[PDB]
Amino acid sequence: NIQGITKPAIRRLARRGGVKRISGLIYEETRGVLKVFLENVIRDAVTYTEHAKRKTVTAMDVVYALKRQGRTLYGFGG
Amino acid sequence: NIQGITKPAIRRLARRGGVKRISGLIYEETRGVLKVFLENVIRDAVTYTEHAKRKTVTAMDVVYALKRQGRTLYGFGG
Amino acid sequence: QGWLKEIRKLQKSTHLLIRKLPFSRLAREICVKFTRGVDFNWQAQALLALQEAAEAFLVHLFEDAYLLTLHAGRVTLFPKDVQLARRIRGLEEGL
Amino acid sequence: QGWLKEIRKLQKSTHLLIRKLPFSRLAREICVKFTRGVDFNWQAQALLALQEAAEAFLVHLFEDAYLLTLHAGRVTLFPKDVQLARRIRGLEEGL
Amino acid sequence: ESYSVYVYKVLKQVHPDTGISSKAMGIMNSFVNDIFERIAGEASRLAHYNKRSTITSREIQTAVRLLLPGELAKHAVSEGTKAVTKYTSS
Amino acid sequence: RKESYSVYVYKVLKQVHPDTGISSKAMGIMNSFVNDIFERIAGEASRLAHYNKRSTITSREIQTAVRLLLPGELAKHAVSEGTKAVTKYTSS
Amino acid sequence: RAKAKSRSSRAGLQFPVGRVHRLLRKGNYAERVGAGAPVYMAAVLEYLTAEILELAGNAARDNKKTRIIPRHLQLAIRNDEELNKLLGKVTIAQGGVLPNIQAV
Amino acid sequence: SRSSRAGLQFPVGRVHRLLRKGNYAERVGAGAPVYMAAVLEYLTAEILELAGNAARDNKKTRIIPRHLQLAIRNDEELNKLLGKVTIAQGGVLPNI
DNA sequence: ATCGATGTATATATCTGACACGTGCCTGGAGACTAGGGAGTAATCCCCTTGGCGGTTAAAACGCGGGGGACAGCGCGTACGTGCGTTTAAGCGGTGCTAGAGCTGTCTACGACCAATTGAGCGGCCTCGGCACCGGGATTCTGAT
DNA sequence: ATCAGAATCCCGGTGCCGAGGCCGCTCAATTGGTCGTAGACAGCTCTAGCACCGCTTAAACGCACGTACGCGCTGTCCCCCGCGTTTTAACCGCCAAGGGGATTACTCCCTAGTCTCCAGGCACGTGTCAGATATATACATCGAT
């Protein structure tokens, strides 16, 4: 399902980032970067979820799992 | 008296960092980044010192200023 | 010159750029590995919070890697720039 | 090739590369501006702790700036590389 | 319990004709809570370093001068030292 | 009297390597390392018990703080060490 | 009994003093919390709230809107330099990145 | 001795007192200092074993903080745990 | 690139739904009193920091020369943006089930809290051996040929 | 490949000083025992997450093509490293004063705790108006006919 992050979506993220031209090897490297980021956030969110006696990963578990990593996310945990 | 951070000392720091060749404009910017680092850490250590009823910047004040700024130091305080 | 119009349009809008359903299936696929094969439920705002965080991380990594690209004397991004920005940013800011 | 012998001899050792007395005068000159005119005393271990921290910060910044230098197709370190290492290093880990 | 009433009161004091959306109000609640946890945790470790048990107004003033940048840490401690000096009059 | 972790770092050192020793400065490094990791794990368990509306740091918050903070292999061995010690302590 | 004057009213504030006192007490920051610390804390939070709400109202008046959406909060935070250092590690949900198409 | 009961070498009484007087939470359980001291003892054993190997590779029978830096920066995971720390009197790991 | 087509700010027109004002209610905050210990505050001992001087001697500085490398110019040729026809999967909008979050109510193990007692751990003190430095062997790299 | 000539470790003395073992003491951890409450735990309600179907239809995709740009080469020319002689300020070792850290002892006053009211803030409910599109009008703004 990592190929569901399509090449127009990666190109849209890069054009939001200000990137003028993009090589064809960015798309297989941005998918790996997204894999590593989502593994690092989802492992902490599943750790918080398993610490509580719940089987549903809530919204606050993602916000706490990001404030763990130092990247705070405003807008869901208040 | 930041010119006491001499040109061979900045060269020694760069050679410890692995730098093979150093331009001549590095020495006036290394004495700017070092001044910015000291004007952050010494400001926080003076704040920690003045919070207590002290006039001596101890080794604990520098260690706590550095731990506040994210760069933990070991072997001096603890 | 459609890149200038596209960058000028995408830097104003606030909508999510990755579509929501294949990001949801990607998050399910990654989440089922850390739960030792059991499947978890996700709140509807949990996937949206994860998607906001992932897209903001991706656009910040892309502007850092484009600073690296313009440092190298070019305009095309090469994955060596993203790989270099991941290790100049650090071990948990770039990873 | 004296730069290679100098790099390996400096990477083997652990001694402070900046001399203790001009760094101490720099630290006191910077400190007297924040203490509202009245001079403060510094402990003997405080100046060494600050000098170890500043030395480690400058060596790590020169490693990052030399990675950017070798990215740009150069071997000469340029102040634009140290500026870009501080810029993509962040607002917290840089400066 | 949230900070919606006070963010709206402050907003109608500052900009009397503007309003705030619901998602921006969630941003403001999360912002007030995050700055609260940062300042309170910094004053907590300030009281822990000096072997004290009380978070006074000096601990909050030092945590404000540490966490905030130079321009804000000279205005926020003015607002705090005007509010406490108003409050003690009672 | 100023309490430190110097004796236990020496006991663990003798157990792992019975012929080496530590200097004074590298005992300060280890005595500050234990204090730093203790502060990190206990603060993470503290905010973890604050999230779940609990007042007790039991072994679940310590184990989950270890799983959160540590990397992949160190977490899988450290929770094994902790669970082995808790089982050995409660079996007494 | 005298009429119940709230502690955020006598301090000339808008953020609550009693609620931030309960949050400092039940927050495990310290085993004892002074009296002037919730007044100081609430004044600092009320100043920082009015400081990003003024710039958010300015960016909403610049976007010809009479309502603040979190895009204007992002344009308020990322433009002022002190608030960009205070909120450097903060991601604003549904907020577009500040327009910087660099002139290289 | 409570520490001896758990088969550890790090103290469980001092760790329990630091957890109670450290303001972390209103109450601290019984097995939380046992678990905490076991994790601290394992991490101290890991970094001291790597530092002892790095000191024996330099043919020294004593650990100076150079060996602790060579233990941290050479190992992959202890470099992720101790990434934002600075070992005093520890030279940078050799590279070029 | 002298105007013609082409994207782009005004402007009124719906229209939806989300903000904001109102009400009822409840629990959390304010008032008043007690009461115990934490912190303010003086008094004092003694560390340790600053300041000074004098020699020394290692590192900094100045200058010169040469060769490495930065950088601009240019050409080949690959690969990326763009356009257009085709196809496909995301999104809406309904619907229906049920797993699980969330709340309440009981009760029991569990952890705070006292006292008494003593062994673990800290400060100090002394010895001895690991390490820093040095001195020739023995080898092992480095520019010039 | 060959040179003479610096450049690196490897055995043996010498010595300093700091680690490590040992001891006295004292305070913090261990042991019993109480007791109040937080959390485990069953029971139940009901939200919202998952799953499905059907139809749009906007976005993804395949293919081709022109051309912008990556990248390797080359040629001036700056300017950084190395070397040799000065030269200067860091550093070590004494020495002496005294400011201020740190501890103790008294003591007030501030803040936890409790009980009682009751007003601030939250949940719910509903009008109405800000904003998202929509579509013809007017206005800059250039690229391709």
Q: Which range of residues forms the domain containing residue F51?
A: 1-92
Residue B22 Ramachandran class (φ > 0 left, ψ -120 to 50 alpha, else beta): beta
Q: Which helix (H) or strand (E) element contains residue F48?
A: helix F25-51
| Tally of CA atoms within 13 A in the half-sphere of E14 that contains its CB | 22
Please state whether beta strands C41-42 and E54-55 pair in parallel, antiparallel, or not at all (unpaired).
Answer: unpaired
Does CATH number 1.10.20.10 belong to domain H1-96? yes
CATH number for the region D1-95 comes to 1.10.20.10
- Closest by CA to A26, choosing from G68, C56, C78, is C78
What three-state secondary structure class fits A22?
strand
How many separate helices (H) and strands (E) can be counted in chain E?
A: 4, 1
Topology, domain A1-78: Histone, subunit A (1.10.20)
Distance between CA atoms of residues E7 and E23, nearest Å: 13
Distance between CA atoms of residues E31 and E28, nearest Å: 5
Binary contact (D11, H92; C-beta < 8 A): yes
From the list D7, D12, D56, which residue is nearest H86 (CB)? D56
How many separate helices (H) and strands (E) can be counted in chain H?
A: 5, 2
Distance between CA atoms of residues D59 and H91, nearest Å: 10
The long-range contacts involving F86-89, CB below 8 angstroms and separated by at least 24 positions, are F86/F59, F86/H6, F86/H31, F86/H34, F86/H35, F86/H38, F88/H5, F88/H6, F88/H7, F89/H2, F89/H5, F89/H6, F89/H7, F89/H12, F89/H31, F89/H34
Q: How far is the CA of E21 from the C1' of I20 (A)?
A: 10
Place of tokens 């012929």: F19
- Closest by CA to C46, choosing from A42, D66, E56, is A42
Binary contact (D53, B20; C-beta < 8 A): no
Do residues B59 and D46 touch, judged by C-beta distance below 8 A? yes
Distance between CA atoms of residues H53 and C37, nearest Å: 39
Place of tokens 């008046």: G61
Domain-by-domain residue ranges, chain B?
1-78
Distance between CA atoms of residues H67 and H75, nearest Å: 12
From the list E14, E41, E69, which residue is nearest G86 (CB)? E69
- Closest by CA to B9, choosing from E65, E34, D10, is D10
Method: cryo-EM
Chain I bases closer than 7 angstroms to a protein Cβ: 7-8, 18-20, 28-32, 38-40, 48-50, 59-61, 69-71, 79-83, 89-91, 99-102, 110-112, 119-123, 130-132, 142-143
Q: For position E34, which CATH number holds? A: 1.10.20.10
| Measured CA distances, H82 to A56, D53, D85, H66 (Å) | 32, 15, 21, 15
Asked if strand I contacts A51 at the CB level, meaning under 7 A, the answer is no
Distance between CA atoms of residues F44 and C61, nearest Å: 28
Distance between CA atoms of residues H37 and H14, nearest Å: 9
How many separate helices (H) and strands (E) can be counted in chain B?
A: 3, 3
D37 min Cα distance to partner chain G (Å): 25
| Interface with chain G: mutation pick from H19, H23, H28, highest number of G CBs within 10 Å | H23
Distance between CA atoms of residues F42 and H40, nearest Å: 11
Q: Which helix (H) or strand (E) element contains residue E42?
A: helix E22-49
Number of C-beta neighbours around residue E70 at 10 A: 10
Q: Give the tokens for residue H73.
A: 């920066």
Do residues G89 and C1 touch, judged by C-beta distance below 8 A? no
Sign of CA dihedral E57, E59, E60, E61: positive
Distance between CA atoms of residues F57 and H30, nearest Å: 9
What three-state secondary structure class fits H27?
strand
Asked if strand I contacts H12 at the CB level, meaning under 7 A, the answer is no
Distance between CA atoms of residues F1 and C70, nearest Å: 59
Binary contact (H89, B71; C-beta < 8 A): no
Q: Which helix (H) or strand (E) element contains residue H46?
A: helix H31-57
Domain-by-domain residue ranges, chain G?
1-104
Q: Closest nucleotide to residue A55 (Cα to C1')?
A: I100
Residues contacting D91, CB < 8 A, separation 6+: G84, G85, G88
| Tally of CA atoms within 13 A in the half-sphere of F39 that contains its CB | 13
Looking at chain A, list the stretches that DSSP marks H as alpha helix, in order from N- to C-terminal side: 7-16, 27-51, 59-69
Torsion angle (degrees, nearest 10) of CA D25, B16, F29, H41: 160
Considering only residues 28 to 67 of chain D, which have any Cβ-Cβ distance to chain H shorter than 8 Å? Answer: 49, 52-53, 56, 59, 63
Q: How far is the CA of F92 from the C1' of I127 (A)?
A: 42
Distance between CA atoms of residues D80 and C73, nearest Å: 13
Q: Which residues pair with H29 in a beta bridge?
A: none
Cα-to-chain-centroid distance, residue A35? 8
| Measured CA distances, G9 to F38, G22, G38 (Å) | 42, 17, 13
Count of positions (residues) in chain E: 90
Torsion angle (degrees, nearest 10) of CA D57, D63, D68, D72: 140
Q: How far is the CA of E27 from the C1' of I19 (A)?
A: 16
Residue B24 DSSP one-character state: T
Q: Give the tokens for residue F77.
A: 């061995």
Q: How far is the CA of E1 from the C1' of I104 (A)?
A: 21
Q: Which residues pair with H86 in a beta bridge?
A: B73
Distance between CA atoms of residues A67 and A45, nearest Å: 11
Distance between CA atoms of residues C25 and C3, nearest Å: 30
Residues contacting F5, CB < 8 A, separation 6+: F30, F31, F34, F35, H10
- Closest by CA to F81, choosing from E4, D91, H9, is H9
Q: Give the tokens for residue F21.
A: 């020793």
- The total domain count for chain E is 1
At G28, the amino acid letter reads N
From the list C3, C40, C82, which residue is nearest A46 (CB)? C40
Place of tokens 């079996």: F91
Do residues G76 and G65 touch, judged by C-beta distance below 8 A? no
Do residues H44 and F30 touch, judged by C-beta distance below 8 A? yes
Burial class (CB in 10 A: 0-12, 13-18, 19+), F68: buried
| Measured CA distances, H17 to B15, F7, G28 (Å) | 47, 17, 16
Does CATH number 1.10.260.40 belong to domain G1-104? no
